[PDB]
Amino acid sequence: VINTFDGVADYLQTYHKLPDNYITKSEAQALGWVASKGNLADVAPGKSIGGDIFSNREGKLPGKSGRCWREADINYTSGFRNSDRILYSCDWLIYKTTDHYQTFTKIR
């Protein structure tokens, strides 16, 4: 797998968690992921980076408490990470970005 905008959106709203194909950056690093080599697929076949706290330091997203915004990679399969991300709040507001957190639009 679930790594589409709709799929992860629907999945979070229900289960209240990301699907089983997500790993945080720290977890990925421990498995040997080297961002500069874009090898995530080799060290963690079928996984995508997701579940880490998004700071919202630029307030480009509705203000929430300290660790209420989280992000997950969307449309990732192999190679370097792309520019697609889903942003989900502790109150389950769902936003998307396709430009590397520059701009956001509501999806749920």
XYZ file of C-alpha atoms in Angstrom:
108
model
C 2.064 -3.048 -1.033
C 0.000 0.000 0.000
C 1.956 3.104 -1.183
C -0.557 5.224 -3.098
C -2.101 8.513 -1.925
C -5.579 7.002 -1.611
C -4.464 3.663 -0.217
C -2.362 5.051 2.576
C -4.995 7.733 3.188
C -7.827 5.206 3.541
C -5.595 2.867 5.523
C -4.598 5.512 8.134
C -8.162 6.738 8.685
C -9.229 3.231 9.579
C -6.408 1.289 11.309
C -4.843 4.452 12.625
C -1.417 3.416 11.511
C 0.660 3.111 8.401
C 0.644 -0.248 6.605
C 3.379 -2.848 7.208
C 5.581 -1.656 4.319
C 6.748 1.476 6.159
C 9.941 1.980 8.205
C 11.250 5.103 9.884
C 14.505 6.666 8.694
C 16.368 5.454 11.824
C 15.132 1.871 11.265
C 16.233 2.046 7.620
C 19.646 3.415 8.634
C 20.165 0.489 11.002
C 19.554 -1.934 8.111
C 22.288 -0.235 6.026
C 20.266 2.294 4.025
C 22.637 4.981 2.658
C 20.588 7.915 1.315
C 23.484 8.990 -0.959
C 23.610 5.583 -2.670
C 19.771 5.395 -2.964
C 19.869 1.689 -1.931
C 16.738 1.357 0.209
C 15.352 -1.331 -2.110
C 18.472 -3.448 -1.638
C 18.548 -3.307 2.172
C 14.777 -3.395 2.759
C 13.003 -4.884 -0.252
C 9.411 -3.619 -0.508
C 9.694 -0.962 2.200
C 9.202 2.774 2.014
C 10.271 5.431 4.588
C 7.312 6.616 6.744
C 6.131 7.336 10.306
C 8.634 10.063 11.256
C 7.574 13.349 12.896
C 7.189 16.317 10.522
C 8.120 19.532 12.302
C 5.847 22.108 10.544
C 8.346 24.797 11.490
C 7.173 26.818 8.505
C 3.544 26.505 9.531
C 2.673 25.443 5.947
C 0.189 23.065 7.641
C -2.558 23.727 10.192
C -0.862 24.271 13.542
C -0.859 21.142 15.719
C 0.936 20.100 18.931
C 4.634 19.271 18.883
C 4.544 15.713 17.599
C 1.164 15.582 15.995
C 2.230 15.740 12.324
C 3.928 12.740 10.703
C 4.965 11.953 7.112
C 5.263 8.930 4.806
C 6.744 8.390 1.341
C 4.186 7.790 -1.440
C 4.748 6.045 -4.835
C 8.185 4.768 -3.848
C 9.455 1.484 -5.332
C 13.265 1.648 -5.702
C 16.180 4.075 -6.093
C 16.468 7.554 -4.502
C 13.398 8.893 -2.711
C 10.934 10.989 -4.831
C 9.069 14.222 -3.938
C 5.742 12.621 -2.915
C 4.688 12.601 0.709
C 1.561 12.182 2.769
C 1.126 14.300 5.948
C -1.130 12.990 8.701
C -2.059 14.621 11.991
C -2.894 13.055 15.356
C -6.518 13.983 14.636
C -6.258 12.336 11.256
C -6.307 15.314 8.927
C -4.565 14.057 5.684
C -2.497 16.242 3.411
C -0.321 15.600 0.424
C 2.720 17.128 -1.182
C 4.145 16.274 -4.570
C 6.831 19.005 -4.491
C 8.992 18.250 -1.492
C 6.963 19.903 1.274
C 6.760 23.202 -0.581
C 2.999 23.133 -0.935
C 0.236 21.080 0.581
C -3.394 20.273 -0.304
C -6.022 18.457 1.771
C -6.977 14.892 0.726
C -8.927 13.599 3.735
